[PDB]
Nucleic acid binder design. Structure first.
Ligand code: MG
Lengths: 230, 50, 76, 50, 49
RNA sequence: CUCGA
């Protein structure tokens, strides 16, 4: 009776988003303790990238319209919140969009640099209807954690930003939903051992080999205040 | 007795807070009490929170 | 005597005398400048009076004697 | 005397007149908060004792 | 002191108030003096009623 | 006068 320690044994990709990670082996109690202390951290705080500020030329606020587009500009701001990017080198980038001609404006038409990579290129942003009409915007992407609304950012700034720089609400977390299952492990003599199958579902801006390592680094950091300091 | 009149049109956007009256279609009223985190809501065995 | 005032009212006798006695005592520390007897432990001048009452250190006869002796001391 | 809508306002610094334009009326699309001045209007006051 | 815009009440005193949380409103009055502040602690506190 | 408890 000493212990047995788990290990990251298997990772498979159902789709570009859906993944299923197993851990093996566990004892009796720890199969249902780690499986609930890894859902409560992977949903709350995981670092991702999100769109923060959109600046379309010719337009002052978000409650007007532009010529030759189907949606209002507020619908374009609602479309640009669901954009799954991945910034590797820097910590804040600015992307440009330019389009002219009849047809939709997909997310693949953004002139990206070498580091950022729009992972879902079939996204839909706008709809152009006239030949002479065009669109042009600059899009700021930051790195964050959790959910930061627009009122907090407009309250926690002091420099005068120019009229036209619209603000978007930022939801940073990549993980959409996550479940876990505990099945009887396949060990030949220690029969009552358990395994833990964490079933992750996200968008394409995270790696399931890295998310569990971040979510266990956080848990081994927060328990460091319990192991020595009383 | 009036020289000139200026009219200014604001545009307030309002989220939900603790206090905003919500109600169904069958006459069940209510006041929102707490905005939980996502991981505290009861979830079924497929992962979807309520 | 922060949560409930059951300990204090069983010494003075009724609530309407407890209120007047504690309001008289709580003004000698507000602007008179007299020092409290119980340790303060970060409280306003009302709860210090309601705690001085409940430990037998402040009454109506004591609050009359303690100011009449000081009026005689002001006479000297 | 008549009242006037001027960008000049007494007893108020630059921190509130940043969004007022040349003529004294706020720009279209300027994000305002509680207490900020939208139209700068001053009124003449008859002289009082001190 | 809580953030938000709604007076949070204890769930046990609602039998006395006859207050259902379906859009009710309650008024907030402050006592100013030092006698009235002692008539709200020894006479009208909710742990005495 | 219409609405809310
Ligand atoms: Mg009601």
């Amino acid at each position: 009776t000493e212990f047995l320690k788990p290990r990251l044994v298997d990772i498979e990709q159902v789709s570009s988003t859906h993944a299923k990670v197993t851990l093996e082996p566990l004892e009796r109690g720890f199969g249902h303790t780690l499986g609930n202390a890894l859902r409560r951290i992977l949903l709350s705080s995981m670092p991702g990238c999100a769109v923060t500020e959109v600046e379309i030329d010719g337009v002052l606020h978000e409650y007007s319209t532009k010529e030759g587009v189907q949606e209002d500009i507020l619908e374009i701001l609602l479309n640009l919140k669901g954009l799954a990017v991945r910034v590797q080198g820097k910590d804040e980038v600015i992307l440009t969009l330019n389009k002219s001609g009849i047809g939709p404006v997909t997310a693949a038409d953004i002139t990206h640099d070498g580091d950022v990579e729009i992972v879902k290129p079939q996204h839909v942003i706008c709809h152009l209807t006239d030949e002479n009409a065009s669109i042009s915007m600059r899009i700021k992407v930051q790195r964050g954690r959790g959910y930061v609304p627009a009122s907090t950012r407009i309250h926690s700034e002091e420099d005068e930003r120019p009229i036209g720089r619209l603000l978007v609400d930022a939801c940073y977390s990549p993980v959409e939903r996550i479940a876990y299952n505990v099945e009887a492990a396949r060990v030949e003599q220690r029969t009552d051992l358990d395994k833990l199958v964490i079933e992750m579902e996200t968008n394409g801006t995270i790696d399931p080999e890295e998310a569990i390592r971040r979510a266990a680094t956080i848990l081994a950091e927060q328990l460091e205040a319990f192991v020595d300091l009383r | 007795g009036v020289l000139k009149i200026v009219k200014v049109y604001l545009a307030v956007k309002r989220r939900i807070q603790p206090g905003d009256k919500m109600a169904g279609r069958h006459g069940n009223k209510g006041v929102i009490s707490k905005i939980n985190p996502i991981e505290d809501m009861p979830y079924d065995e497929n992962g979807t929170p309520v | 005597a922060r949560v409930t005032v059951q300990d204090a009212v069983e010494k003075i006798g009724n609530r309407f005398d407890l209120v007047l006695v504690a309001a008289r005592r709580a003004r000698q520390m507000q602007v008179g400048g007299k020092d409290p007897l119980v340790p303060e432990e970060n409280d306003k001048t009302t709860v210090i009076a309601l705690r001085e009452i409940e430990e037998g250190l402040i009454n109506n006869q004591i609050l009359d004697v303690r100011e009449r002796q000081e009026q005689q001391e002001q006479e000297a | 005397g008549p009242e006037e809508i001027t960008a000049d306002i007494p007893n108020v610094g630059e921190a509130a007149l940043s969004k007022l334009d040349e003529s004294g009326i706020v720009y279209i699309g300027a994000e305002v908060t509680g207490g900020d001045i939208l139209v700068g209007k001053v009124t003449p006051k008859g002289e009082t004792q001190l | 002191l809580i953030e938000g815009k709604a007076i949070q009440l204890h769930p046990l005193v609602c039998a006395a108030y006859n207050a259902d949380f379906d859009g009710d409103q309650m008024a907030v009055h402050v006592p100013l003096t030092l006698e009235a502040q002692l008539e709200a602690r020894a006479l009208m506190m909710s742990t005495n009623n």
